[PDB]
């Protein structure tokens, strides 16, 4: 394992609230469909659903604040972020998030993604370190500060990075019948505060044969060396990009519009309103 760092400040950062508009839709399956409208019941992000915007770290005076909370998982999670800074590197999923139970660790870095399932003893304020190498004049990984120890490991997976390099990243996480399923999409945008209007379905990223309870998760962040000085001020980092959006999936019935190339271009939340209930009864 590694040593742990106490980052959470006495002064917390307040969450904001926004809507999902019509986002969070994803290809429920790998079945090809073309020029057709398909009805399916599954865990979807209801339209205009309650969404929370968290700021994990901030520099004001230059005062430091940190509040990177452990959130519930409920029936599934919609996660989104806007950052060109590669600050968000992954997530931790599990129940107790300590050595008493298994937990899922998903970490990205420049070269690969690592996914592990272990009895982890997690730091209260987990994170990854990065610093600016002055001779190579570039950013590099410093030290993991995520967990104190890890045993009983039952799953390890390595592949290519997907969080690395006006860019909206969207993820949906489900934990069903032993599989942790991840869907994602990258979209370019010109909006700052609120989730953009428009439609974009998320493509299947990976199904993982994990087989564990998940009731909570926490985001993993990469912090600059600049931020770890012993003072309360951080002059060497415009940390405002370290924020993310969280909504939650619900069992809903949706109509999905597949165009002639098999792409989902529109959807209907049948329970949203009478008009949608009508389009679902009519099936057109």
């Amino acid at each position, epitope marked *: 394992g590694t040593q742990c760092v106490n980052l959470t400040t*006495r002064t917390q950062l307040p969450p904001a609230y926004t809507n999902s508009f019509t986002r969070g839709v994803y290809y429920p399956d790998k079945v090809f469909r073309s020029s057709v409208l398909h009805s399916t019941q599954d865990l979807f992000l209801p339209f205009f659903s309650n969404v929370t915007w968290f700021h994990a770290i901030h520099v004001s005076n230059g005062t430091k604040r940190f509040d990177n909370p452990v959130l519930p998982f409920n029936d599934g999670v919609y996660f989104a972020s806007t950052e060109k800074s590669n600050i968000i590197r992954g997530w931790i999923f599990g129940t107790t998030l300590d050595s008493k139970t298994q937990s899922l660790l998903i970490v990205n870095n420049a070269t690969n993604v690592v996914i592990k399932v272990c009895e982890f003893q997690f730091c209260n304020d987990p994170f990854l370190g990065v*610093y600016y190498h*002055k001779n190579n004049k570039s950013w590099m990984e410093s030290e993991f500060r995520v967990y104190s120890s890890a045993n009983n490991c039952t799953f390890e997976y390595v592949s290519q990075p997907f969080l690395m390099d006006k860019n909206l990243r969207e993820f949906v996480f489900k934990n069903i019948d032993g599989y942790f399923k991840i869907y994602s999409k990258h979209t370019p945008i010109n909006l700052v505060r609120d989730l953009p209007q428009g439609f974009s379905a998320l493509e299947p990223l990976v199904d993982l044969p994990i087989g564990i309870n998940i009731t909570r998760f926490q985001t993993l962040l990469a912090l600059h060396r600049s931020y770890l000085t012993p003072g*309360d001020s951080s*002059s060497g980092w415009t940390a405002g990009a370290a924020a993310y959006y969280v909504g939650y999936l619900q069992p809903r019935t949706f109509l999905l519009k597949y165009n002639e190339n098999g792409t989902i271009t529109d959807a209907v939340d049948c329970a949203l309103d009478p008009l949608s209930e009508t389009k679902c009864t009519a099936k057109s």
Partner: antibody, heavy 119, light 108 residues
């Protein structure tokens, strides 16, 4: 303006304990991380320990890990170093120093206090 | 993590003294230089390899090169005879380190 004044140094037998104090003035103590650095007579500078602005985190040099405890009382603008299980090799002037805000060096130094460990 | 600098450097008055500090960490992070005279607390001379504090005269210049940083003192005078220490900090902010120190002797 800024002042750091050490106290608590003296002569003590090996294995005994001693508590150093540093009284800070002229700046917002609580906003700055604080260090102890030491210097054995005739020898060079050795970083000993650092404490964060709010005490949330503490780091110790390997030579003193397990023996020394750094702490602070921001309401009294006072930094402390508790030295337990002193060894002959702890004989040194102990300096209090301020961690520059925003970098990795020391921008202000105390006048030092002498600790002599001897049987 | 450890910083290696020569124990003694001798220069004549008016000449340029060059004190080197080497170590792998120096390729990653900034180095800092301090002057200490007998019976006194150290005084910052160079920070971030090359920058001078307001009180530090222009005769003190810092440079860097791979795993070695260099403090250059031009126009060396008698008052510059002292011990000079290089300093760094690790990647994660858990450790500060001093070099062994260099005694600068002014000849004549």
């Amino acid at each position: 303006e800024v002042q750091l004044v050490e106290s608590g140094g003296g002569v003590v037998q090996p294995g005994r304990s001693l508590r150093l104090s540093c009284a800070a003035s002229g700046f917002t103590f609580s906003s700055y991380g604080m260090h102890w650095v030491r210097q054995a007579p005739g020898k060079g500078l050795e970083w000993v320990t650092v404490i964060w602005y709010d005490g949330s985190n503490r780091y110790y040099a390997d030579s003193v890990k397990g023996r020394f405890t750094i702490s602070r009382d921001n309401s009294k603008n006072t930094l402390y170093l508790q030295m337990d299980s002193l060894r002959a090799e702890d004989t040194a002037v102990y300096y209090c120093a301020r961690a520059v805000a925003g970098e990795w060096y020391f921008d202000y130094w105390g006048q030092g206090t002498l600790v002599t460990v001897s049987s | 993590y450890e910083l290696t600098q020569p124990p003694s450097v001798s220069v004549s008055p008016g000449q340029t003294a060059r004190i080197t500090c080497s170590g792998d960490a120096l390729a990653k992070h900034y180095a800092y230089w301090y002057r200490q005279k007998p019976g006194q607390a150290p005084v910052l001379v160079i920070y971030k390899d090359s920058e001078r504090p307001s009180g530090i005269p222009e005769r003190f210049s810092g440079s860097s090169s791979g795993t070695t940083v260099t403090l250059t003192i031009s126009g060396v005078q008698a008052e510059d005879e002292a011990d000079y220490y290089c300093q760094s900090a690790d990647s994660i902010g858990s450790s500060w380190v001093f070099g062994g120190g260099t005694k600068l002797t002014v000849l004549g």
